[PDB]
Design a protein around this motif. Sequence first.
Motif, PDB file in Angstrom:
ATOM      1  N   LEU A 303      -1.996   7.661  -2.091  1.00 32.98           N
ATOM      2  CA  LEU A 303      -1.485   6.613  -2.728  1.00 32.98           C
ATOM      3  C   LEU A 303      -0.236   7.501  -3.386  1.00 32.98           C
ATOM      4  CD1 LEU A 303      -1.833   3.756  -3.516  1.00 32.98           C
ATOM      5  CD2 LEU A 303      -3.433   4.663  -5.469  1.00 32.98           C
ATOM      6  N   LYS A 304      -0.524   8.883  -3.726  1.00 35.49           N
ATOM      7  CA  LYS A 304       0.735   9.650  -4.412  1.00 35.49           C
ATOM      8  C   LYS A 304       2.081   9.369  -3.960  1.00 35.49           C
ATOM      9  CE  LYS A 304       1.549  14.024  -6.638  1.00 35.49           C
ATOM     10  NZ  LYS A 304       1.418  15.669  -6.579  1.00 35.49           N
ATOM     11  N   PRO A 305       2.278   9.700  -2.600  1.00 37.15           N
ATOM     12  CA  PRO A 305       3.728   9.339  -2.149  1.00 37.15           C
ATOM     13  C   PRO A 305       4.060   7.986  -2.066  1.00 37.15           C
ATOM     14  CG  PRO A 305       2.464   9.806  -0.255  1.00 37.15           C
ATOM     15  CD  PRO A 305       1.353  10.104  -1.436  1.00 37.15           C
ATOM     16  N   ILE A 306       3.115   6.935  -2.219  1.00 39.06           N
ATOM     17  CA  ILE A 306       3.519   5.781  -1.999  1.00 39.06           C
ATOM     18  C   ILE A 306       4.154   5.166  -3.353  1.00 39.06           C
ATOM     19  CG2 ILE A 306       2.573   3.134  -1.748  1.00 39.06           C
ATOM     20  CD1 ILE A 306       0.527   4.519   0.213  1.00 39.06           C
ATOM     21  N   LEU A 307       3.502   5.577  -4.292  1.00 41.96           N
ATOM     22  CA  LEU A 307       3.666   5.024  -5.628  1.00 41.96           C
ATOM     23  C   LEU A 307       5.020   5.478  -6.307  1.00 41.96           C
ATOM     24  CD1 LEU A 307       0.319   4.283  -7.184  1.00 41.96           C
ATOM     25  CD2 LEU A 307       1.294   2.891  -5.784  1.00 41.96           C
ATOM     26  N   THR A 308       5.235   6.769  -5.999  1.00 40.31           N
ATOM     27  CA  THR A 308       6.434   7.309  -6.495  1.00 40.31           C
ATOM     28  C   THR A 308       7.758   6.793  -5.797  1.00 40.31           C
ATOM     29  OG1 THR A 308       6.875   8.959  -4.523  1.00 40.31           O
ATOM     30  CG2 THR A 308       5.341   9.497  -6.170  1.00 40.31           C
ATOM     31  N   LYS A 309       7.684   5.810  -5.069  1.00 36.51           N
ATOM     32  CA  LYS A 309       8.908   4.849  -4.688  1.00 36.51           C
ATOM     33  C   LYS A 309       8.903   3.648  -5.165  1.00 36.51           C
ATOM     34  CE  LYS A 309       7.069   4.954  -0.292  1.00 36.51           C
ATOM     35  NZ  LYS A 309       6.967   4.868   1.339  1.00 36.51           N
ATOM     36  N   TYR A 310       7.927   3.246  -6.113  1.00 39.34           N
ATOM     37  CA  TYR A 310       8.094   1.795  -6.587  1.00 39.34           C
ATOM     38  C   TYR A 310       8.129   1.820  -8.261  1.00 39.34           C
ATOM     39  CZ  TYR A 310       6.542   0.132  -1.942  1.00 39.34           C
ATOM     40  OH  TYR A 310       6.710  -0.116  -0.675  1.00 39.34           O
ATOM     41  N   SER A 311       8.997   0.987  -8.713  1.00 37.77           N
ATOM     42  CA  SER A 311       8.994   0.841 -10.202  1.00 37.77           C
ATOM     43  C   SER A 311       7.748   0.187 -10.839  1.00 37.77           C
ATOM     44  CB  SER A 311      10.528  -0.064 -10.384  1.00 37.77           C
ATOM     45  OG  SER A 311      10.055  -1.281 -10.072  1.00 37.77           O
ATOM     46  N   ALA A 312       7.944   0.190 -12.120  1.00 43.33           N
ATOM     47  CA  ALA A 312       6.863  -0.630 -12.827  1.00 43.33           C
ATOM     48  C   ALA A 312       7.040  -2.174 -12.550  1.00 43.33           C
ATOM     49  CB  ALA A 312       7.036  -0.390 -14.271  1.00 43.33           C
ATOM     50  N   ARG A 313       8.336  -2.453 -12.489  1.00 35.19           N
ATOM     51  CA  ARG A 313       8.458  -4.066 -11.864  1.00 35.19           C
ATOM     52  C   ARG A 313       7.433  -4.229 -10.698  1.00 35.19           C
ATOM     53  NH1 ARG A 313      12.261  -7.985 -13.423  1.00 35.19           N
ATOM     54  NH2 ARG A 313      12.282  -9.724 -11.882  1.00 35.19           N
ATOM     55  N   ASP A 314       8.333  -3.466  -9.746  1.00 40.42           N
ATOM     56  CA  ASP A 314       7.531  -3.384  -8.569  1.00 40.42           C
ATOM     57  C   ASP A 314       5.955  -3.805  -8.610  1.00 40.42           C
ATOM     58  OD1 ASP A 314      10.367  -3.496  -7.490  1.00 40.42           O
ATOM     59  OD2 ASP A 314      10.046  -1.335  -6.916  1.00 40.42           O
ATOM     60  N   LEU A 315       5.457  -2.863  -9.093  1.00 37.55           N
ATOM     61  CA  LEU A 315       4.075  -2.665  -8.857  1.00 37.55           C
ATOM     62  C   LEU A 315       3.386  -3.858 -10.082  1.00 37.55           C
ATOM     63  CD1 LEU A 315       3.742   0.912  -9.974  1.00 37.55           C
ATOM     64  CD2 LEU A 315       3.392  -0.041  -7.873  1.00 37.55           C
ATOM     65  N   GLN A 316       3.848  -4.324 -11.153  1.00 34.65           N
ATOM     66  CA  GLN A 316       3.600  -5.567 -11.643  1.00 34.65           C
ATOM     67  C   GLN A 316       3.513  -6.816 -11.160  1.00 34.65           C
ATOM     68  OE1 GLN A 316       1.709  -4.736 -14.991  1.00 34.65           O
ATOM     69  NE2 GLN A 316       0.959  -6.692 -14.107  1.00 34.65           N
ATOM     70  N   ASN A 317       4.702  -6.695 -10.276  1.00 35.93           N
ATOM     71  CA  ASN A 317       4.803  -8.258  -9.401  1.00 35.93           C
ATOM     72  C   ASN A 317       3.576  -8.287  -8.376  1.00 35.93           C
ATOM     73  OD1 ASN A 317       6.805  -9.637 -10.254  1.00 35.93           O
ATOM     74  ND2 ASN A 317       8.462  -8.448  -8.905  1.00 35.93           N
ATOM     75  N   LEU A 318       2.961  -7.297  -7.858  1.00 32.86           N
ATOM     76  CA  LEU A 318       1.924  -7.331  -7.148  1.00 32.86           C
ATOM     77  C   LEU A 318       0.709  -7.358  -7.695  1.00 32.86           C
ATOM     78  CD1 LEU A 318       0.241  -6.863  -4.368  1.00 32.86           C
ATOM     79  CD2 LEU A 318       0.508  -4.454  -4.782  1.00 32.86           C
ATOM     80  N   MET A 319       0.450  -6.593  -8.991  1.00 28.43           N
ATOM     81  CA  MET A 319      -0.553  -6.913  -9.853  1.00 28.43           C
ATOM     82  C   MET A 319      -0.940  -8.084 -10.416  1.00 28.43           C
ATOM     83  SD  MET A 319       0.054  -2.878 -11.627  1.00 28.43           S
ATOM     84  CE  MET A 319      -1.108  -3.085 -12.750  1.00 28.43           C
ATOM     85  N   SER A 320       0.116  -8.509 -11.044  1.00 25.03           N
ATOM     86  CA  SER A 320      -0.114  -9.926 -11.558  1.00 25.03           C
ATOM     87  C   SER A 320      -0.489 -11.026 -10.662  1.00 25.03           C
ATOM     88  CB  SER A 320       1.094 -10.452 -12.572  1.00 25.03           C
ATOM     89  OG  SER A 320       0.961  -9.320 -13.713  1.00 25.03           O
ATOM     90  N   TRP A 321       0.318 -10.972  -9.446  1.00 19.93           N
ATOM     91  CA  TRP A 321       0.502 -11.921  -8.360  1.00 19.93           C
ATOM     92  C   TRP A 321      -1.270 -11.864  -7.848  1.00 19.93           C
ATOM     93  CZ3 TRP A 321       0.798 -16.148  -5.896  1.00 19.93           C
ATOM     94  CH2 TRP A 321       0.380 -16.278  -4.724  1.00 19.93           C
TER      95      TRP A 321
END
Length: 698
Positions: A303-321
């Motif tokens: 997960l470490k190299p994956i999540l460095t590539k994404y913004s807070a916005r990108d993550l929350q779009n998946l998380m809330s979905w």
Amino acid sequence: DDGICKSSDCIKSAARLIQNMDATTEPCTDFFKYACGGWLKRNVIPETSSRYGNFDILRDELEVVLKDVLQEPKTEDIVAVQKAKALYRSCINESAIDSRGGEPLLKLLPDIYGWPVATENWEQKYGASWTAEKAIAQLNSKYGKKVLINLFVGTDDKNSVNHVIHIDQPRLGLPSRDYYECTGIYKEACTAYVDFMISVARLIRQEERLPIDENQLALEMNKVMELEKEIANATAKPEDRNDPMLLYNKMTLAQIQNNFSLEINGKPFSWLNFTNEIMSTVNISITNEEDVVVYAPEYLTKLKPILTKYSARDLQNLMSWRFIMDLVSSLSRTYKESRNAFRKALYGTTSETATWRRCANYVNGNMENAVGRLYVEAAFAGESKHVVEDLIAQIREVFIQTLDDLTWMDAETKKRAEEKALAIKERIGYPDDIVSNDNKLNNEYLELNYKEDEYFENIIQNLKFSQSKQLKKLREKVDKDEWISGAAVVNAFYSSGRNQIVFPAGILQPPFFSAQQSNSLNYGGIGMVIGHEITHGFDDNGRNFNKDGDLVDWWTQQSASNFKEQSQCMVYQYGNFSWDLAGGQHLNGINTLGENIADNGGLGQAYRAYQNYIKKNGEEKLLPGLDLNHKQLFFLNFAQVWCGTYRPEYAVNSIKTDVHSPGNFRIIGTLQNSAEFSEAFHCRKNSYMNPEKKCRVW
Ligand SMILES: O=C(N[C@H]1CCS[C@H]2CCC[C@@H](C(=O)O)N2C1=O)[C@@H](S)Cc1ccccc1
Ligand SMILES: *[C@@H]1O[C@H](CO)[C@@H](O)[C@H](O)[C@H]1NC(C)=O
Ligand SMILES: *[C@@H]1O[C@H](CO)[C@@H](O)[C@H](O)[C@H]1NC(C)=O
Ligand SMILES: *[C@@H]1O[C@H](CO)[C@@H](O)[C@H](O)[C@H]1NC(C)=O
Ligand SMILES: *[C@@H]1O[C@H](CO)[C@@H](O)[C@H](O)[C@H]1NC(C)=O
Ligand SMILES: [Zn+2]
């Protein structure tokens, strides 16, 4: 006296057996078709079902009982029952739900840091204070939704009286990691998934009176899919999670911080902060020497190299979905309909089940003891409990006696296996005190307060309640009196951490069991179920847990090596089965192994118990209209448990997600391994149902 049973109970059994079977098929060529071909010709999977068969029919019939007991108030109802009925009434009132539109979801979104795609100026409103620690923890602690990192309180595999924090990989929006290939048989599901995202985002923006830019919606939601594809590919396959000894990795939170660092939205991830953001909701403080069981260390590393590539916005779009996709079916018709193509792609269904059925099941799932009480008072007979208790005692003893005949274990390991078998705790029917202790039942639900015009608030309250309950258990001992299933359930269960078998009232009925049906049928039905569940204590998972539910090795090196040798036969056997409904794909022989071990051992245990029964009591009277002896009826009833069929879309799903084999292969695989089956039907050697090579564990 012609020797034939002529009771009404024998008549009902015989008619069912006759109607389901196809006697024009040779039993030794295909026993599924022989036992079930009549059922298959007569039935069509309903539009609302992904699978249909005698198990699904029993569950549909149990729902009818739940409707009968939930839909009418009674003056004497205690508060627990009043609450279950009020919840039911709130659920079936579609007029009240439809009149609220999506407003209940709109009110909720600020509490989960919004859904960026349906939010104007997300970065200013929520990004400013956003942290992965707070955003993930909010969904987990308040709503029970685990995204990106699955942290939960569970039983300690290595100390079954205690609870401990676990960290694991999260579930995915699609049924399994395989779907994220998004080609061939998975393409429709992937397309429907993103279209579903887009449709809900569009509905929310419409209701909020925001402009719709179709290209922007597709851009953001395809980025959600690209993110979750990376998450999925990082997860471990089920085949690599099947050894509980290797899965268990206990370490401190300080260790977790040293070994699994994460940089998200440019900020170092604080595991301690994340854990306390969750546990604080139940007033529990956590320091850096807290022990944690990490089930997915490789996943966190990936997960470490994956999540460095994404913004807070990108993550929350998946998380809330991932939360929203669960909620749309509790909103108005317009929101419900947005899920249609996604549902068809995963399940093949063209319609949702009746509202009263969904609602009865929802109330049963959230108030299992209140609904269980109503169910058993309506549908469960007295002396049944005691008869099943005695059948369990017989089959337990058969398991222990069979240990002497098993050549692949040494004496020391056999003694340890007997110790565990003697310690299995049996639960039959229902806990007596759901009927006899009103105070305790009321107090289980005391913190719940439902409003009959507020279904959405009611289900949100239930999410919070069940997650608060789970988290509060961290410092508490495991409650040995707790049942692992409600009573209004057509299933049976084994728990390796409790070393407990359960047979809910819902499964103690025909074809499995009746005090008035022939014993061949009872042993082939519930007898097999009993052996199945006992054998789970000794399958590729259960064998790793001792008599008290602790993950401790009680096998000699040789006997453990031999267990793997013996069980490997079944991995290859079932892995060689091709499933036409799943496009000709092969079953996963590793992922179904435990259930296949339980099937094969359980049927044999039940058969040997039935032989002992005949030895002691003599032959039973024959069933009318069937030119079959009772040994043959034993296997016929076993097989008819599994009469059924699947929609192709759901076969694609279940072959990847189900730890059980499909019903037809539970029949074929188990009976192929049974010398007794081939003796009963006089199968020629190397007929399809009587291969010379037979697998055997228990
Ligand atoms: O085989 C089992 N139980 C099945 C029941 C049929 S359905 C199946 C497929 C879908 C996933 C899962 C679900 O019901 O959700 N599942 C089960 O649990 C075992 S453990 C209990 C049992 C064994 C033999 C006869 C009857 C019960
Ligand atoms: C459904 O809810 C509406 C709005 O609260 C209410 O007027 C109506 O009586 C309810 N219907 C039933 C059958 O309770
Ligand atoms: C999937 O994960 C593996 C292991 O981390 C990696 O080698 C591979 O490149 C990944 N595939 C994609 C498409 O990201
Ligand atoms: C976690 O860190 C945030 C700052 O990012 C802080 O506001 C919050 O109080 C911390 N929570 C706990 C439980 O320490
Ligand atoms: C099928 O059975 C053979 C014989 O044991 C085995 O070598 C092979 O790996 C099996 N195939 C699958 C897909 O399980
Ligand atoms: Zn099972």
